[PDB]
Design a protein around this ligand. Structure first.
Ligand SMILES: NCCCCCCOP(=O)(O)OP(=O)(O)OC[C@H]1O[C@@H](n2ccc(=O)[nH]c2=O)[C@H](O)[C@@H]1O
Ligand SMILES: CC(=O)N[C@@H]1[C@@H](O)[C@H](O)[C@@H](COS(=O)(=O)O)O[C@H]1O
Ligand SMILES: [Mn+2]
Length: 272
């Protein structure tokens, strides 16, 4: 074989993305016969330099996930990526912790395969153009840059929520993500602070190819706005070495290897 071309000959460009169509995981599996157990795929005729673990924070979002899988699997294959899908399921009924779930996905995926790239994607984001490559770059990559719920633009230049990608070294560089953000908000801003403090710039595709759709939804119970988030963002420079990968504690309760993804149910503790 040889290295995969910088531009895949499979890309179609702009895509029609909607969430009313009846989707079936059996059908999705049937439509993607090259997707191996656990949501793993590898280009047959070229060597992908990108070994990407796609981490999805999850609790009670099976319907959103079904649409995510339905759209992403064809897209990711056309992008000629050596990838695997990881759905990190938070057990219990405590406050939701998006960032801690992402940390779990990082460590757990590394236990399966020597990934060198990590895409962190919300379960409800779908790219509208397959040129928006779900891989890592020389700088930390922000992927969901032109979401429809933000009028197809950035709400602010520091916005790092939604979908993003850090290489293994980039991720380790900032001691990963915080674990102390319980509830909604601020954890993405905190992560942006970490990248800045370690001297990294954010890489983004243009607003045209970075158009993504957000599945409109109501707030999940136990994901209410965190009142402490403002203070924590203020002190990111102090806490990023005391809160992250080096302080991550969790308990894997269950692992399930579905055809289209690996589901890891974890106990990540409670707020304090
Ligand atoms: N009612 C209208 C406004 C709703 C505002 C509530 C927050 O919505 P968002 O800002 O999009 O964030 P979010 O989608 O709730 O949470 C982020 C991501 O974490 C995941 N997530 C969050 C909460 C939850 O109970 N389960 C879950 O899986 C999911 O991947 C989600 O995509
Ligand atoms: C401190 C804080 O709350 N930062 C939040 C971010 O976590 C969030 O990513 C962004 C998008 O919000 S959204 O339009 O409601 O999705 O809004 C900011 O205010
Ligand atoms: Mn959402």
């Amino acid at each position: 074989l040889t290295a995969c071309p910088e531009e895949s000959p499979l890309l179609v460009g702009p895509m029609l993305i909607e969430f009313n169509i009846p989707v079936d995981l059996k059908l999705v599996e049937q439509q993607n016969p090259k997707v191996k157990l656990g949501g793993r795929y590898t280009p047959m005729d070229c060597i992908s330099p990108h070994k990407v673990a796609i981490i999805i924070p999850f609790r009670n979002r099976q319907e959103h996930l079904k649409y995510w899988l339905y759209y992403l699997h064809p897209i990711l294959q056309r992008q000629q990526l050596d990838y695997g899908i990881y759905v990190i399921n938070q057990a219990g009924e405590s406050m939701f912790n998006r960032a801690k779930l992402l940390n779990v996905g990082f460590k757990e995926a590394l236990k399966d395969y020597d990934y060198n790239c990590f895409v962190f994607s919300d379960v409800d984001l779908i790219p509208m153009n397959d040129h928006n490559t779900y891989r890592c770059f020389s700088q930390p990559r922000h992927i969901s840059v032109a979401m429809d719920k933000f009028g197809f633009s950035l709400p602010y230049v520091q916005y790092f929520g939604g979908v993003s990608a850090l290489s293994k070294q980039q991720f380790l560089s900032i001691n990963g993500f915080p674990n102390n953000y319980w509830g909604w908000g601020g954890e993405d801003d905190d992560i942006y602070n970490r990248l800045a403090f370690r001297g990294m710039s954010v890489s983004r595709p243009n607003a045209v190819i970075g158009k993504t759709r957000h599945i409109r939804h109501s707030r999940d119970k136990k994901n209410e706005p965190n009142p402490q988030r403002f203070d924590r963002i203020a002190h990111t420079k102090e806490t990023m070495l005391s809160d992250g990968l080096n302080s991550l504690t969790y308990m894997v309760l269950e692992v399930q290897r579905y055809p289209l993804y690996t589901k890891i149910t974890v106990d990540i503790g409670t707020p304090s």
